């Protein structure tokens, strides 16, 4: 995916001050986690370290732009329920009715709102570590099957699939 053609918004999920101990004291760095997305079905996340916070955030954006994925979206919701699982991060994502809006936790919300999903239910069922919740969310979103492509794979019409 070329991020130049997409109009990508950036959202700063978290900035953790981490420390490497050395003789004399402690080398602090900042680990920024940022999600970016076009709000039209593409979303990605990246992680950047640096000694200053602005530079950390800049490096996260470049990383995120490298790893964009395409989230299948039926109308304003997801095609079907899925449980995004990654390590201990375990996010359930359920399709919702029109006008429900995005009902998700903090980090999960960033991913879904930047992906441009308008109506979706979610619930974090495992660890709330931001990095792993995001990884679980994108793993789950990456497993969503669109009805049209399923029909092609199974050799049927969409009429037969939906029934």
């Amino acid at each position: 995916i070329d991020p130049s053609k997409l109009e990508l918004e950036e959202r700063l999920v978290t900035v953790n001050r981490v420390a490497k101990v050395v003789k004399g004291g402690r080398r602090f760095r900042f680990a920024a986690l940022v999600v970016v997305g076009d709000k039209n079905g593409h979303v990605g996340f990246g992680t950047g370290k640096a000694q200053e916070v602005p530079e950390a955030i800049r490096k996260a954006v470049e990383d995120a732009k490298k790893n964009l994925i395409e989230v299948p979206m039926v109308g304003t919701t997801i095609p079907h329920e899925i449980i995004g699982r990654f390590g201990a991060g375990n996010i359930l994502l359920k399709p919702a009715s029109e006008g429900t809006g995005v009902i998700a936790g903090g980090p999960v919300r960033a991913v879904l709102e930047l992906a441009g999903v308008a109506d979706i239910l979610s619930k974090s069922l495992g660890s709330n570590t931001p990095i792993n919740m995001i990884r679980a969310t994108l793993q789950g979103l990456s497993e969503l099957k669109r009805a049209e492509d399923v029909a092609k794979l199974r050799g049927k019409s969409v009429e037969e699939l939906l029934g």
């Binding site: 095609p79 079907h80 009805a147 092609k152 794979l153 199974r154 049927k156 939906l162 029934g163």
Partner: protein, 131 residues
């Protein structure tokens, strides 16, 4: 010992599918054979052969992969188990993956999919989900 042949057959498919095997051979039974036939009719497997022998027969199932070697069958779950049977009313027959998958219900009309059983307003034992 063997306690759920249906579950065991589903697992053979799941495991073979996971490593993108072309075919697998399942020891046959009337009920397992009916499930296999549904998978073909619904386009989850390529073909199913029934080989006779002195014993109970063998079902050779040919798995189906799309372009880019993509697995058509994403997952299989056993629902009704020997330890806890699951029977559904006609109106409570489950849809699987929001209608993108199927459920196989054993009914007095026969072994049907969820859609087929629903049209007949029939319930019964919910054997498995396939998506």
């Amino acid at each position: 010992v063997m306690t759920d042949p249906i579950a065991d057959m589903l697992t053979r498919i799941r495991n073979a599918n996971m490593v993108r095997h072309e075919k697998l051979e399942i020891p046959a039974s009337k009920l397992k054979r009916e499930i296999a036939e549904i998978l073909k009719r619904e386009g989850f497997i390529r073909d199913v052969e029934f080989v006779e022998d002195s014993k109970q027969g063998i079902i050779r199932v040919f798995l189906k992969y799309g372009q880019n070697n993509e697995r058509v069958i994403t997952g299989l779950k056993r629902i009704s188990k020997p330890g806890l049977r699951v029977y559904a009313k006609s109106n409570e027959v489950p849809r699987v993956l929001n209608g993108l998958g199927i459920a196989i219900i054993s009914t007095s009309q026969g072994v049907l999919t969820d859609k087929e059983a629903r049209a007949k307003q029939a319930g019964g034992e919910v054997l498995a989900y396939v998506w």
